[PDB]
């Protein structure tokens, strides 16, 4: 069976596919599809950014390393890594120790 990590990656892949799918075949996210994913599935992690549509569009532009106005999964997964990193940084914001402890992460 799948590990916890494999299931988390599966959720990322399927969420990407739910907005990119075109006529039942896998595709890429255009700007409109990216905004819908961010608006719904990242409504908490990107709560403040979602209030400024221009900010969301520039995140798309920054991730669009292929310069084709489209996010392949390879382009998109960099946002997933950045948000995972950002959430962990939020858990340790201003940490003084001792020991290891996680405060609430992004969107909390």
């Amino acid at each position: 069976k799948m590990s916890q990590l494999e299931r988390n990656i599966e959720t990322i892949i399927n969420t990407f596919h739910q907005y990119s799918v075109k006529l039942g075949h896998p595709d890429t996210l255009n700007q409109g599809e990216f905004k819908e994913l961010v608006r719904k599935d990242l409504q908490n992690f990107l709560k403040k950014e979602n209030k400024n549509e221009k900010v969301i569009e520039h995140i798309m532009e920054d991730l669009d390393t292929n310069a084709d106005k489209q996010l392949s999964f390879e382009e998109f997964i960099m946002l997933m890594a950045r948000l995972t990193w950002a959430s962990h940084e939020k858990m340790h914001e201003g940490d003084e120790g001792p020991g290891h402890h996680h405060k609430p992460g992004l969107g909390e």
Partner: protein, 89 residues
């Protein structure tokens, strides 16, 4: 409540800490810790590269440990590979 995608991202943090909290630095996965991470969390086509090969690739600053950023390199590569394999069937 967080979405399922957001829960998946926070769960990736928890997966790493199952191994980084074993010993030593709280955000360091040492070579034997990485072997257990790969054997428990990754599929066979990822494990097949070898734990020592993965460790050398991930330990960017050659300090003998994998920190959280370096673990995200593994997550990125596992995700791209899992997407590609799902995109072949």
């Amino acid at each position: 409540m967080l979405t399922e995608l957001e829960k998946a991202l926070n769960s990736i943090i928890d997966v790493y800490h199952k191994y980084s909290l074993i010993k030593g630095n709280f955000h360091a996965v040492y070579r034997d810790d990485l072997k257990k991470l790969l054997e428990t969390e990754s599929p066979q086509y990822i494990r097949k590269k070898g734990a020592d090969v993965w460790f050398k690739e991930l330990d960017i600053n050659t300090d003998g440990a994998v920190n959280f950023q370096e673990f995200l390199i593994l997550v990125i590569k596992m995700g791209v590979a899992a997407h590609k394999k799902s995109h072949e069937e």
